[PDB]
Coordinates of C-alpha atoms in Angstrom, one line a residue:
Chain U
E1 CA -11.1 27.8 17.3
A2 CA -9.8 25.2 19.7
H3 CA -12.1 22.5 18.3
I4 CA -11.1 23.3 14.7
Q5 CA -7.4 23.2 15.7
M6 CA -7.9 19.9 17.4
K7 CA -9.7 18.4 14.4
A8 CA -6.9 19.6 12.1
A9 CA -4.2 18.2 14.4
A10 CA -6.1 14.8 14.7
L11 CA -6.8 14.4 10.9
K12 CA -3.3 15.5 9.8
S13 CA -2.9 14.8 6.1
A14 CA -4.9 11.6 5.9
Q15 CA -6.0 10.9 2.3
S16 CA -9.0 8.7 1.6
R17 CA -8.7 5.8 -0.8
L18 CA -12.0 4.8 -2.6
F19 CA -11.0 1.2 -3.2
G20 CA -9.1 -1.6 -1.6
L21 CA -7.6 -4.7 -3.2
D22 CA -10.1 -6.0 -5.8
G23 CA -11.8 -9.2 -4.8
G24 CA -11.4 -10.8 -8.3
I25 CA -8.4 -13.0 -7.7
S26 CA -8.1 -15.2 -10.8
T27 CA -6.0 -13.5 -13.6
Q28 CA -5.2 -16.5 -15.8
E29 CA -7.6 -18.3 -18.2
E30 CA -9.0 -21.7 -17.4
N31 CA -7.3 -24.6 -19.2
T32 CA -10.0 -26.4 -21.2
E33 CA -7.7 -28.6 -23.2
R34 CA -8.1 -32.3 -23.2
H35 CA -5.4 -34.8 -22.1
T36 CA -5.3 -38.3 -23.5
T37 CA -2.9 -41.2 -23.3
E38 CA -1.8 -40.5 -26.9
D39 CA -0.2 -37.2 -25.8
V40 CA 3.6 -37.2 -25.9
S41 CA 3.6 -35.1 -22.7
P42 CA 1.1 -33.4 -20.4
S43 CA 1.6 -30.1 -22.2
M44 CA 2.1 -31.2 -25.8
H45 CA -0.2 -33.3 -27.9
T46 CA 2.4 -34.2 -30.5
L47 CA 5.7 -33.2 -32.0
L48 CA 4.4 -32.8 -35.6
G49 CA 6.9 -30.5 -37.2
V50 CA 9.9 -31.9 -35.5
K51 CA 12.7 -33.3 -37.6
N52 CA 15.2 -35.8 -36.1
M53 CA 18.0 -34.6 -38.4
Chain Q
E1 CA 0.9 49.9 42.8
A2 CA 3.8 47.8 44.2
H3 CA 1.9 44.6 43.8
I4 CA 0.9 45.4 40.2
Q5 CA 4.5 46.3 39.4
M6 CA 5.8 43.1 40.9
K7 CA 3.2 41.1 38.9
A8 CA 4.2 42.8 35.7
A9 CA 7.9 42.2 36.4
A10 CA 7.3 38.6 37.2
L11 CA 5.1 37.8 34.2
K12 CA 7.3 39.7 31.7
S13 CA 6.0 39.0 28.2
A14 CA 5.0 35.3 28.7
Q15 CA 2.6 34.1 26.0
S16 CA 0.3 31.2 26.5
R17 CA 0.2 28.3 24.1
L18 CA -3.2 26.5 23.9
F19 CA -1.7 23.2 22.6
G20 CA 1.4 21.1 23.0
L21 CA 2.7 18.4 20.6
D22 CA -0.2 16.4 19.3
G23 CA -0.4 12.9 20.8
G24 CA -1.3 11.3 17.4
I25 CA 2.1 10.0 16.4
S26 CA 1.5 7.8 13.3
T27 CA 1.5 9.8 10.1
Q28 CA 1.9 7.0 7.5
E29 CA -0.7 4.5 6.4
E30 CA -0.7 0.9 7.4
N31 CA 0.6 -1.5 4.8
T32 CA -2.1 -4.1 4.2
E33 CA -0.5 -5.7 1.1
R34 CA 0.1 -9.4 1.1
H35 CA 3.5 -11.0 0.6
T36 CA 3.9 -14.4 -1.0
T37 CA 6.8 -16.6 -2.1
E38 CA 5.9 -15.8 -5.7
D39 CA 6.8 -12.2 -5.3
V40 CA 10.0 -11.1 -7.1
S41 CA 11.0 -9.0 -4.1
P42 CA 9.5 -7.9 -0.8
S43 CA 8.3 -4.7 -2.4
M44 CA 7.3 -5.8 -5.9
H45 CA 4.9 -8.6 -6.8
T46 CA 6.1 -8.9 -10.4
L47 CA 7.9 -7.0 -13.2
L48 CA 5.1 -7.3 -15.7
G49 CA 5.8 -4.4 -18.1
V50 CA 9.6 -4.9 -18.1
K51 CA 11.3 -5.7 -21.4
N52 CA 14.8 -7.3 -21.3
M53 CA 15.8 -5.5 -24.6

């Protein structure tokens, strides 16, 4: 009885977790797009549909 | 007889307790979560499912 009471007091209400933080860190997708000196900007190749007025 | 009566009077109805307060104080679980400058708040990493309207 004493040992079981001691075990219950020591364990308290501890709940086991099966997993920690997942080791797969990357969530985005790799950027495979080219980048040439003809690009209007580092993020846009052209401004094709743009109308000045 | 006198000694037994004195012992009974002195002890009264004292009941022995096998345990005191348990020395294990911590009841919560340790917070192992990271905290970066990208977090929207100290308690939330992001607001992913939130819709503005």
